[PDB]
Structures are given as C-alpha cells and as structure tokens.
Symmetry: D2
Amino acid sequence: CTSILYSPKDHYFGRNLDYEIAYGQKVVITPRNYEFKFANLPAEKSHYAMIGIAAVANNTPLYCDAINEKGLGVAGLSFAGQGKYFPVVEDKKNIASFEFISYILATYETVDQVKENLTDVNISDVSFSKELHWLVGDKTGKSIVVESDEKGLHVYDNPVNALTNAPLFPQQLTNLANYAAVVPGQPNNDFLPGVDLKMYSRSLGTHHLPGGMDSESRFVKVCFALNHAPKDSDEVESVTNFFHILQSVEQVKGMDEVGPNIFEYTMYTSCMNLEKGILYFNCYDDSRISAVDMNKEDLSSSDLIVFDLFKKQDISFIN
Amino acid sequence: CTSILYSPKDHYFGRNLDYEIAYGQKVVITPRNYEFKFANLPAEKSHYAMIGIAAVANNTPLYCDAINEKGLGVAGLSFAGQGKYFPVVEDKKNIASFEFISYILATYETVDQVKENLTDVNISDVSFSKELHWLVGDKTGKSIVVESDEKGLHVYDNPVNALTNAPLFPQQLTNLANYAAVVPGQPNNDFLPGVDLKMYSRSLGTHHLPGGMDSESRFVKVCFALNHAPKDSDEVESVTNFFHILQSVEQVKGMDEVGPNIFEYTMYTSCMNLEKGILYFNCYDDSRISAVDMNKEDLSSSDLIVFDLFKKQDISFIN
Amino acid sequence: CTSILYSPKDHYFGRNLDYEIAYGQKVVITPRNYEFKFANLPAEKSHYAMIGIAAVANNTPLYCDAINEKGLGVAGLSFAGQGKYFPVVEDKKNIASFEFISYILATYETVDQVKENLTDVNISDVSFSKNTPASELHWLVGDKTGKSIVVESDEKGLHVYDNPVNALTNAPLFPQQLTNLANYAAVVPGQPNNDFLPGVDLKMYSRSLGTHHLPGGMDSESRFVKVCFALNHAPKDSDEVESVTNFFHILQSVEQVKGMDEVGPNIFEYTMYTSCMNLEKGILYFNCYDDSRISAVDMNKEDLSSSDLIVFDLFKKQDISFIN
Amino acid sequence: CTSILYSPKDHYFGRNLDYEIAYGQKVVITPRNYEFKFANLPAEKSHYAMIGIAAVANNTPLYCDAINEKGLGVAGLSFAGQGKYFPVVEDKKNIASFEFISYILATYETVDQVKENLTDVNISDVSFSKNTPASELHWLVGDKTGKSIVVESDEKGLHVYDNPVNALTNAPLFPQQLTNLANYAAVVPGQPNNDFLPGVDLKMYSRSLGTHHLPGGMDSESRFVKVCFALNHAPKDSDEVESVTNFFHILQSVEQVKGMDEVGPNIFEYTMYTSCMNLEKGILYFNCYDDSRISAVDMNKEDLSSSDLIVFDLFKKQDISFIN
Ligand SMILES: *CC(=O)CC[C@@H](C)[C@H]1CC[C@H]2[C@@H]3CC[C@@H]4C[C@H](OS(=O)(=O)O)CC[C@]4(C)[C@H]3CC[C@]12C
Ligand SMILES: *CC(=O)CC[C@@H](C)[C@H]1CC[C@H]2[C@@H]3CC[C@@H]4C[C@H](OS(=O)(=O)O)CC[C@]4(C)[C@H]3CC[C@]12C
Ligand SMILES: *CC(=O)CC[C@@H](C)[C@H]1CC[C@H]2[C@@H]3CC[C@@H]4C[C@H](OS(=O)(=O)O)CC[C@]4(C)[C@H]3CC[C@]12C
Ligand SMILES: *CC(=O)CC[C@@H](C)[C@H]1CC[C@H]2[C@@H]3CC[C@@H]4C[C@H](OS(=O)(=O)O)CC[C@]4(C)[C@H]3CC[C@]12C
C-alpha cells in the first residue's frame, strides 16, 4: 500500500490499497452523533464527523483511511513482520488497532494535537473477534507516522509525507539516501570526467529509480513523484495530479505474486480534500473518478451514510 | 513513449504518448475512399479503412498510432539520436516517415505481409515541410520493429511485443537479459545459502525492476507487466488490463525533466481492439476511458471523421 | 572498512582498513604480563596475550583489530552517525572505546563468554587522545567456533546481535544491514532460470548474469552485501596457505582503490592495509596498499611471558621479485 | 576478463584473465629473429620482439596479451556469442585469430598504424588446435600515445572502434558497452547534491553514497562499468613503482574470487593472473591467484636478436615473507 499527503494549494490525503482479496469496503460517512463504543476507552456519543473508505461490519465502520471535518486525516497500512500490539495496561490509554482511525479522527483536529496526546497511548491486542501502522496528516502540510513494534509505540515526524509497509520508518528514511544522486533530468558527467557519454535517452538521471512492487521500491518512487508534483493548482487539477502520483506505484495484476497464482493489485485509490471534505475515488475496474461530499449531508445525524466504492468500467461511448 | 501488443483473447494495440507539448491530436477515422497522396509513391484512392490518433493538418491525417479494418496495427515512436532517413533512390520504394503509418495500414493486412514487402523499402528524408521508429502488430499475436539507422532499414522480430525509444532494438533485447533473475514473487535464497534472510516485504523478487522514466527502464518494466498480464478475458476486462499495463510506465508531471522547467508526461493512452476496430482512449486530464467504433460509420465514404481526444476530468458526482 | 570471520577449516579473523588518515599503525604483540591500566576498571597485571594491528602512544597499544592466544578476535570499525558513547555510571561496567579490544581480548575466551558478560557493560565517553577527532566505533567479535556477534552502542544504549553472515562494515545499525540483505535474495553466482519473462528466449549474453545487481560501490551497504556474498561462497576445507590466499581475495573484492571514494577536496579513502589472523595458530598475515606481498608474524614465536610490547613494521614498500 | 590501458606518466598495458580452464600459460619473450609462420600471410623471419603471456605449443607462442619493443600492446579477450570468424578469401588480408596478437605486435608500431592497416583485413576461421574448443575473441590495442582501439569481428564483418575509456571486457558489442556507460552518469566518487528530494534533509549515513549504484557483479557489463570508473579516477603523474601498484589495484577492483562466478557444476571462473606491461620500458609485471606478490621480467635484459622463445614461470606459490 502507498499513502501520501499532497499540498499543492489545498491539502489532499489518500492511499492506494494493494491487496489480493476485498473486504466489502465502501464509502461511509460517520456523522457527529454516531455513538462510538471503544474496548478500553470511554464512549463518544458526540464527536467530529468523518468520511472515508471502510468495511461496514453490522452498523459499525471499520475504516481503512478517512478524514474528519477539522482537516485531519489518518490512513492504515499493513505492518506485517514488524508491528507488535500489547495487552491492555491500566497505566496508559489503550486503543485497539481497528478503532485507532475512528478514535483519532473523532477526538482531535491537528497533527500536533495527535502527536502530543499519544505519549500515554498503548495500541492494544484487542481484535474485532479472532499488524498495522498509520500515517496521520493535516492541513499544515505535515504528517507523522505511528508504529508500534517490539520496543513499544513510536511517533515519527514524516519529512516526505508518504508511507508504505515494512520495514521500520527510520529504516525507510535511511534507504532514501541511497538514491540521493537521482535527478528527474540529465546528471552532470562527474562519473567519467573528460569522456563524452552518449546521453541516448531523456531522464537518464532516473535510471536507478526503483520500480518494484515491494515496500521499499514503492516508498522511494512515490516520495520522488510526490516531491516533484505540480503546485499551486485548483481543485480538479490537484486531484488529477494526486491520482497520477499514486499511479506511479500502481500494482498491476500479475506483477506482485504473494501466493500460488495469487496476486496483490491496486484495488482502489482514494483522494480526500482535507479542507472541503470531499472524497474522490476510483478502483481497479473503474478508471473514472467519483466524488462524495461529506458536507452535503446532515452531519448532526446519527446513522452511517454508505456509498458504493467498487464499480464497473464507466466507458463513455462517443458513437 | 511505450507501445504494446496485448493478446488476452482478442488482440489490442496501443501506446503511451509521453511528451511536453501537444500537436492538436484527435481521434480520426480515414474511410476507404479518402485519397492518399504520397511523395514518391503512387496514390491510393481505394484502400483499407483505419482509425487512430492523428494530428489533422488541413484535411490530411498525420497518424501517431492507428489500426485498420483487417486487424493490422502500426505505432510511431521517437528514435532521436539513433534513426537516420535517406534521400530518395530510384532502386527502392521510397516512403516518407510521416506517411509510413498511413501507407502500411492502407495497403497490407498482416505482419508477415508487411515484413516481406519491406525488403525494397527506403524511409526517405521527405519532411512535411521543414527521427522515428515503428512497432507493427496484427491478430496473430506477433509484432515486428522497423528501424532505419546509420546502416539502413531494419525489420526485427519482436519477441516481447513492446517498444519504447533509444537505443537500437537489438540492444534493448540484450538489456532485457540483465533482469533475468526478477520474479513477481519471492526468490529462492541461493544468494546466501544456509542463512535465513528476513523476507520483510512481499515481491522482493522485483526489488531491481526498473522504474525510471528513461527509455530502457520503461522498456524493461512494460515487458514485465505485459508478460504477466491476465489472459482469456472479455472485452471490458481486457481493455481495463491494457490501460493498467501502460499505467505501469506512466510519466507523471515533474518526474521527467527534458528542459529548464519543461517536463515530459503521458499526454494520452490509446487502446485499439484489432478485431472489433474500436479505439479506447483517455488522457492526462481525463481518467475516464472513451471509445470510438470505426465500424459504426460509413467506411465507403471519403471524408475524415474526427473526434475529440483531449477532454477534461469527467468526475462522477455521487452527491 | 570491512571485517570478516572465515572458517574453511581453521578460523581466520581480519579486516580491511579503508581511510584517508593514517595513525602510525604497526603489528603489536601484547604479552601476558604487560600491565593494562583501564580508565574505570581494575588494572590487570596478568591476562591473555594478543597480537594485532595497533598504534602505540606513550607505550599503550590502541588496537584497531587483534586476536588473543586463545582464539578469540575483535575488530573495531567506525560507526559514525549511529554510535553514541555515554558518561560513566557507578553501577555499570564502564569500558572506554579505545580499551574495548584490549579489555575483551585480555579477559575472555569465547563469543559466548563475551556475550554473557556484556549484560551490564556501558561504553563510556572517556577518550584517550584529546586532540585527535575520532568517530564512534562498533565491534565484531568471533572465535574458533565459527560464530560471531556485533557489539553496537547507539542512541538507545548497548546492543549485542548474533551475526549470521560473519561480516561487518559501517553504518547503518546491524538489523538494518541484515534487512538490506533480503533485497538481494535473487542474486546467484551463475545464471538464473528465466521466470522473468516466461515464454521468451532471453539471450544470456554474458556469464554470471545472476550477479548483475551485486553492489560494487565504496559505500558501507554495498561492501557489506558483496563481502557477505564473497564470504559465503568462498572455498572450504583448505590448508593454511590456500585459506589465507582465499581470505585476502574475499576482502580484495571490496577493496577501495585511490580515487573511487572521495571524502573531501581531492582526499580519498582507500584500503590502507588488510589483516588476516589465524585464530588457531595465532599467526597474523597482512599486506598494505603499497606492498601487495603478504607478510606473517607468529605470536607464539615470541616470549609471551614478557612485560613489554613487541612491535613490527606494518606498512612496507612494494616487494617486487625480479625474475631476471 | 578485463583489460585496461593506464597512462599516469608512463603507459601500462595489461589485463585480468578470468577463466575456469588453464592452458599452461607462461611469460614468453619472442625475439626479433624467431621466424613467424602465418597461415595465409607471408612468413616474417625478422620483425619486432615482444613480451607477454602465452601458451607454447610445438614451439609456437599463442599469446593472450603482450607488448612489443616499440611500445604497442594487444590483448585478447573472449567474445562468445558475438564474435564470428570467416572463411579465407583471396582479396582480403587473412589473419587467423590465434596469430592476431603475434602478427600485429611484430609488424606495426602505433595504434594509428594498426588502424590504417586493418582496412582490408579479414579475421579467418583457421584454428590452431583442432580439439581445444575456444570461443571467438575480440582485441584491445593501445600504445604510448594513451589512445586505444577495439578490434571486433562479428556477424557483419570486422569493425575498429576508437576506445574513449581505454578498457575492454567481453560481450556485448563495444557500441553497446559505451551506451551502457551513460546509464551511470549520475555516479560520483563522493556525495551528490540532494536534487533527488529538494527540501528534505536526507541523512547521508555513509561515505561515497554516490557509488551506491556502481556495479560490482562478475558479469561482463558490470566489470566494464566499474573498471572504467576505477581507471578514470586512478592517480596520475606517478613514478614506476607507484604506477604499477595503482595498476594492479584498478584490476583488483573487478577481481573474480573463487565461488562468485559459477560457470558449471561447482566450476567457477576466477581471476587466474594479472599482467601489467610498461610500454615505455618493456617490463612485464604479473601475479596470479595463488601468488599475491608481484614479479617482473625485463624484455631488454635478454638478447633480442636471438631466434628462440625465452620462457619464464607465470603461476607461482604464495610467496609469504615471514617477519620472525
Ligand atoms: C496494502 C496493505 O498494506 C494491505 C492492508 C489491508 C490488508 C488492511 C488495511 C486496513 C485493514 C482493515 C482495518 C479495519 C479492520 C481491522 C481488523 O483488525 S483486527 O481487529 O486485529 O482483526 C481486521 C479487519 C479490518 C477491516 C482490516 C482488514 C485489513 C485491511 C483492509
Ligand atoms: C514519446 C515519444 O517518443 C514522442 C513522439 C512524438 C514526439 C511523435 C510521435 C508521432 C509524431 C508525429 C507523426 C506524424 C508527423 C510526422 C512529421 O515528421 S516530418 O515530416 O519529418 O516533420 C512531424 C509531425 C508529426 C505530426 C509528428 C509529430 C511528433 C510525434 C507526435
Ligand atoms: C573504516 C573504519 O570503520 C575504521 C575507522 C578508522 C579511522 C579507525 C578504526 C580503529 C581506530 C583507532 C582505534 C585505536 C585508537 C582509538 C582512539 O580513540 S579516542 O579514545 O578517541 O582517542 C583514537 C586513536 C586510535 C588509534 C583510532 C584511530 C582511528 C581508527 C584507525
Ligand atoms: C575472459 C576472457 O575473455 C579470456 C578467455 C580465455 C579463455 C582465452 C583468452 C586468450 C586465449 C588463448 C589465446 C591463444 C590460443 C588461441 C587458440 O585458438 S584456436 O585457434 O582455436 O586454437 C586456443 C588456445 C589459446 C592458448 C587460447 C586459449 C583461451 C584463452 C586463454
């Protein structure tokens, strides 16, 4: 998976969901008066509204990535082989992994607010019944990474506004330095001084840009694509550029084999305007972008407002 | 640029057009009785119909990539620094570079027919007024590459059904062997036998798959994405997979700097069913796929039938 | 710099030392009765004897890498940007960085012994030289059992990791070095089977295309990956002369030639010397950048009950043998 | 195998020979009056004298690489999969593959002379040994002018390319090797400026991160790229002993250690020897896999007017100098 925070003028928060099987995900809006019930935390009958992609498990939203009305955004990505949850403790505040996105987006407003309030937080091992890390951004253009591993909970400042999967986030930032010579154009020939190299192709400075489907390759490329994306754009141009950024690490069917004839592919791509509260999305089967505006519904309500995420190819026939 | 021939069940032929400035390209259909006039070749008042992307230069179609009704397809890609045209000679048949796509698709039917008839062909230096190589495929699932360089004209068999830019095609096939160890899944640990390597990420066998925007990187990745694409699919699923294949080498704005604050990006993506004569397309600004059916117009006509290629973002609003 | 532990039959400990500054290193044997005076640890008048490469300042052996008479070796490699020393604390067993090799070699016998006794050890910030800037170090420890460990003191304290590849370079932290190894699991010494484009006859134009992505850079991660590959595939079950020859070739595969590693204005880091120490026989083989010929010093050919350092020349001129 | 032309002050021609099969090579001086009998060319009873590495079969020098008394050198490297020999034709100047080094060295003096005289030369398929399978070769030719050329005979005939990097390995064709060099134009020996993610403080955790993508594989393209990097950045304006030391280190950067290049069932291609020939003084420096010490043979210390081959031992045992 690949999540980014993009700030050309407005602020946009979304992710690619690359997996092999769907979970019945849908576009759900959680109004301010939907009563949240947490395992080891007090209930929240009044909170901020939020919109995002979630799997509805009998009137309860299990979010994958969402934003609230206050301009905060959280996205959950797999951390298999690295993350470790811990049994609940009376000392710290215990949030289960599946309610993290819901609790954070319903309570807080900014990344600074989230960073300060996580010092007494323990990600509990409470399952829904029978390993993830998160990316949190806001309207300031900054983001943090929340990872709970063998050494406990960690909150890192994210200088690149992106996140994928394994390994630990400090290791991902270290691997970024391995590509410091990459440039979008042509490099200066300090490789063989005094020798005229045949610059046979444009953009030879990206010849070693990673293009694999593994977590490190997708992290390096999406950091590159996001950093050089256009800026100072209006809404339609910004959301258009956002999708192209995540398309640069698209996982096509057949390229990522996770099991015997089992492939992981980009199931859906979400783009959420942090200011206007609009969720844009397409999927693997539908290239056309759809939009859902959370601020066009009664937020003071108390029932989930669900929309369809996976659609079929909406081809426009000109004949 | 990146052109492919994709044969899941039906046969599909298209390309990415990655450039920095548009040329007023449009979806044009050339009926069977549009009179072609060639520089050093006899005119063709009766020929096969064809549909493709072209820039209309006063009633004359200058094609970038097109297919005919007989299931043949040609696509033109830049060959800068490598190609060389030659002055016209009375010995050989002289085709100018800009009429190559039109002459081939109006005269012949199959790749075998094109390969045999190119033995007495010279690509002339006749400009429209004041360097390209081609990819030719058909319904057999095979393709050839036509390149005219310093050593004359060359017709190569294409075992990978793909093409980009520089260098020469035999050199592109040689560079493919540099990635023979790449697998879509996890490799067997014959790297350090007797050592348990921490397979921290899925698809570590693609860690060295190229992801740059240069011609060699895009050639290696699109060959990989095309070879492992799904097969035995219906029309909608096949065209959907075709676009994802070319998206795997999408050029996002800011990643490919060809000049001072000048960037080359994927302007449009075309997908043409070789059997049904349908052209599918989207562009950088519009993610929704459009379709034009050549067999829904009077082919026995004599006037070009032009449609709009570049559109704006066709967002579907659910609220 | 690159340090390895090689066990074809006997066990060999050694390293390349790649730097741009020399410190007057020499082959230094420390006998069993040279009184070691430690900063915040009791002075040991008698101990194990050791042989290695060291700088001698005020008749004190400051070892870069060495082995003791009992077949245990320790090598010191720079850990700049990651390592961190700590102030002296009363509870912990305080060992200064410059005395780590000397203390470990003189006290303990095996890797398990060393690993069991670093439980309450703190690496102190006490420095020997007050005007020579030096980056923090981390250590590789091996013995005749063929196993090795990595001793690292970073921001979060001291850590001891088991080393499954028996090699070490510089940054980053060792768990990150092992993680980076998985990025090269597809590398093979020969030719891989074409599961890249099944159905296409890829033209294997050259031999050993399975190593086309083997790193060859002068940086820390590149030399770590390649030396792990070269060490794992080196011949085994060899005699003394053949094993020593194979050892120097393993480290030659990651040698740093003058001009390839620029560390300043026309200042280049290069492989200054290469040490190779037989753990079983206590023999130190070595050469340098200027002398390709291999020299040897047997620790057991000297009086180990002595009380003073026995030094020999390390850097030599090129020893060309003129055939006519 | 890797061949280079190194010009720090004097000019040095040499190569690594990486293979799994030995052919009894030795240092062979061919005096000026050893009668050369050529397959389809006139026999030259007197010519230039040469020194190099060769196998002697029936008192015939089959050179792998050599230089002549006038400062011109030629090295033979395998071109398997690309090279093609041709039948003898009456018009063209037919030179067999095994006599190319001997003929060129004995006839001509400079690279320009050689380049001017291959205009009508055809590389014939006449083979010396009828039972020893050998792949087609291509050649690197240099002289005291610091320039070099590449002689390749492929499917489309004979070609002579000017070599701007003064190095050569194996496949593919030389214009493809030069094209592949451009894929590494971003490599620097030090640290690059961060135009990768402008506005982000990338943590340069290690030195020489500009070489993180320098190839280090055993294959033909990897060793060609790295040896071009190592040759271009080697020190210059050096004396005899320093230049020879730098020369062996350049080729050591692409050395093939046993176990890294698998060419069959537990059969490995490794660097068997390394030759280094001073073009100005006619001195051949060399070592081998088993002997790290450098030996030398001066061609001018022997009678060049002689009529018989003067041979010396190439492969030697490890010459360890015992300090005590
Ligand atoms: C690209 C990737 O990294 C793949 C991530 C994918 C498998 C995850 C991402 C979000 C997950 C859902 C989050 C909400 C709940 C959490 C529950 O955790 S449990 O309580 O410990 O069982 C599991 C179900 C569900 C719906 C997650 C399913 C997996 C995800 C879609
Ligand atoms: C991604 C790439 O490789 C970029 C290719 C792009 C610049 C080309 C592809 C097709 C070209 C057009 C083909 C038709 C004519 C040909 C004329 O050639 S000339 O006669 O020699 O001048 C030039 C105009 C035009 C319309 C080409 C323009 C460039 C292309 C779109
Ligand atoms: C490439 C590497 O990782 C090696 C770096 C190289 C420059 C180091 C390795 C061993 C060092 C010496 C160790 C012994 C003493 C330690 C003293 O530390 S102090 O406490 O700060 O004084 C400094 C001097 C010396 C000789 C070290 C010098 C640097 C090293 C050779
Ligand atoms: C790594 C490389 O490219 C080098 C390959 C290596 C095995 C070759 C290089 C030089 C060869 C010898 C050259 C002299 C003769 C030539 C004879 O050719 S024949 O006409 O077919 O008989 C074969 C024998 C010999 C000694 C060559 C052997 C192979 C090489 C050492």
